[PDB]
Amino acid sequence: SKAAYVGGADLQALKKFVSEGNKRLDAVNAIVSNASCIVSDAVSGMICENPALISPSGNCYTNRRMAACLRDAEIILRYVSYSLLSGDSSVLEDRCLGGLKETYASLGVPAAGNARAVGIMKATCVAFINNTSNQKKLSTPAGDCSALASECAGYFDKVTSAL
């Protein structure tokens, strides 16, 4: 539960422990600072493509179910963001994905809908990392983040595979 602060010498060290530390931190900043939209756009895209999901027999029907789906999509996004901070997917694969498919099966949370919500978040995050905007309309120094984008994509692919 305790918040950790990594700055100064500890942040300098973290940048020696992971590849492309500065770019990595920019990528994480983009995702976390836009998290509500990334999540809402993914869940609402899943729904707009399959409106049955908010019909009365749909798994997102009622605020409570919508809230649970938005929450889970945020949980997944956050474990991906943390994977990108860390340079690996171990915590994502254990804490987030471990037992998740079985949990969803016991609750009746639909695999097709999850695949689409996750797929949209993937596209969105990859696009934030491979942002081709002019420098004037770009918050970070312009350059090539394709390796990190592919890394991020790989983390989403692990979620897709598990679910």
Binding site: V6, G7, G8, A9, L25, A68, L70, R78, Y79, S81
Partner: protein
Amino acid sequence: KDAQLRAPVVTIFDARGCKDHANKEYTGPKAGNAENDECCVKVQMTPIKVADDAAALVLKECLSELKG
């Protein structure tokens, strides 16, 4: 699995040039450069929650954009 439905909430502070917030949260040693002494990452395992108002507003967006 996480029984409490926690996830890591990460906050990224590029605070280079900020004069008005005292950089006191990070308690370790300094690096001797602005790229690290005026930058900080915050990480906290946090129960992830979505309130009724947020879910209700997403539903309003959805209802006006359902594809035929």
